[PDB]
Amino acid sequence: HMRIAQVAPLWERVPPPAYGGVELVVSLLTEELVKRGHEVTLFASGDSMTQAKLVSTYPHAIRLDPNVQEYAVYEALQLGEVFSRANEFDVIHSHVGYTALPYTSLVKTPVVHTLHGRFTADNERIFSQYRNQNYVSISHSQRQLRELNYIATVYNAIAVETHHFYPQPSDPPYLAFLGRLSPEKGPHHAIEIAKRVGIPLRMAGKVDRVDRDYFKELIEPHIDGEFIQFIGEADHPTKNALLGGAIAMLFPITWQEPFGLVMIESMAAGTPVVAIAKGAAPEVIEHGKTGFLCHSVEDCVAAVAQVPQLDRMACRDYVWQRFSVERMVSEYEAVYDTVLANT
């Protein structure tokens, strides 16, 4: 019974064929919001696929589009389209970060900001000046600016039914890395863990413009093609066979992870996660059940020997209980009611 605007980043298609975290959450939230009888307008790339109304300022995803050199041009276009149509919505749900804060004070329509990212020394200055705005975090450890007006915590979710469940891992063992080849994800840790335990590592993910040197210096020289394998950017079927076949997924972040969708994607396939207890990993993994929280590489190596002790169906059942779209969208519906009443 609401008019809702979903403003997505333009780097990826809202249902992204391969890499894409924020866009994927926007997809799940938007489709379920439409099923619940709301009039939803989605602001996203032109190739996006939604049953809501799609208003786009570019036909394709920006990251892998070769004709685009200035992402900010189309980012500003869609920001101008949204807030200049502010009277056609009851609430604006923005997912594009701080670039929407200076527009929010200029329109009557209340705006909800879902924080999808780490806090940095720079962005804290702009969030501080707009402290009295409606923010929603995706984990508790993310709230490093305890002066912002946090309306609620809404954990992210995946579509568990669309992930195939694997009862037992592949017959010759192998570990899995899934994610962008970034130091923040620590694929260098994953490679070192693999031959310390003697178990091969299969990796999937993109190597985008900012990590080419890092991949070039620390990741590429270790890729055998046999013990260390790199398939590159994987689509949904590819990553599901990647995670499902592994005894465990290595998540050795060196970073203040806000959430980590690949963790709940690994558990949905029935594969537990060996992660480092940074960021939101303690809130996502139940230690000694759906994975192991570790505080060093040697802890991760010691934990890999204890991953067959886990019940794999409990991993999938865990994802159903906490990270389903049903719960997430219902929690976002509770946010919209709060913002539209406590104005």
Ligand X SMILES: OC[C@H]1O[C@@](CO)(O[C@H]2O[C@H](CO)[C@@H](O)[C@H](O)[C@H]2O[C@H]2O[C@H](CO)[C@@H](O)[C@H](O)[C@H]2O[C@H]2O[C@H](CO)[C@@H](O)[C@H](O)[C@H]2O)[C@@H](O)[C@@H]1O
Ligand Y SMILES: O=c1ccn([C@@H]2O[C@H](COP(=O)(O)OP(=O)(O)O)[C@@H](O)[C@H]2O)c(=O)[nH]1
131 is in an annotated binding site: no
Mapping DSSP to helix (H, G, I), strand (E, B) and coil, where does residue 92 land?
Answer: strand
Strands (E), 101-207: 111-115, 134-137, 150-153, 175-178, 201-204
| Token pair in block for residue 198 | 């003697």
Radius of gyration from C-alpha coordinates of the chain:
20
Is residue 122 a contact point for its own copies (CB under 8 A)?
yes
Is residue 255 a contact point for its own copies (CB under 8 A)?
no
Residue spans of alpha helices (H) in the chain: 22-35, 71-84, 101-104, 123-129, 187-197, 212-214, 236-245, 261-268, 281-284, 297-304, 312-322, 325-341
298 is in an annotated binding site: no
Indicate the residue among 99 and 153 with the shorter CB distance to its own copies: 99
Residues 199-228 that bind ligand Y (CB under 6 A): 204-206
Q: Which entry of ligand Y, ligand X, its own copies, none binds 118, CB below 5 to 8 A by partner kind?
A: ligand X
- Beta carbon of residue 19, minimum distance to ligand X (angstroms, whole number): 7
> Rounded to an integer, what distance in angstroms lies between the CA atom of residue 94 and that of residue 81?
13
Residue 282, burial from CB neighbour count under 10 angstroms (0-12, 13-18, 19+): middle
Long-range contacts of 75-84 (CB under 8 A, 24+ apart): 75/9, 75/10, 75/99, 78/7, 78/10, 78/43, 79/7, 79/103, 81/43, 81/55, 81/57, 82/5, 82/7, 82/43, 83/107, 83/109
The residues near 30 (Cβ < 8 Å, ≥ 6 apart) are 6, 14, 40, 42, 50, 52
Residues 127-156 that bind its own copies (CB under 8 A): 129-130
Residues 27-86 that bind ligand X (CB under 6 A): 69-70
- Beta carbon of residue 30, minimum distance to ligand Y (angstroms, whole number): 16
Q: Which entry of ligand Y, its own copies, ligand X, none binds 204, CB below 5 to 8 A by partner kind?
A: ligand Y
Binds its own copies (CB under 8 A): choice among 1, 37, 66, 67: 67
By the 8 A CB rule, do 78 and 57 touch? yes
46 is in an annotated binding site: no
Residues 161-190 that bind ligand Y (CB under 6 A): 178-180
| Token pair in block for residue 114 | 């879902």
Is residue 123 a contact point for its own copies (CB under 8 A)?
yes
239 is in an annotated binding site: yes
Q: Which entry of its own copies, ligand Y, ligand X, none binds 23, CB below 5 to 8 A by partner kind?
A: ligand X
Binding residues for UDP: 19-20, 180, 185, 234, 239, 261-262, 265
- By CB under 6 A, name the binding residues for ligand Y: 18-21, 24, 178-180, 204-206, 233-234, 239, 259-262, 265
- Which spans of this chain sit near ligand X (rule: CB under 6 A)? 9, 11-12, 20-23, 69-70, 97, 116-118, 120, 180, 182, 184, 208, 210
The residues binding its own copies (CB under 8 A) are 57, 67-70, 72-74, 76-77, 79-80, 83-84, 98-99, 101-103, 105-107, 120-123, 125-126, 129-130
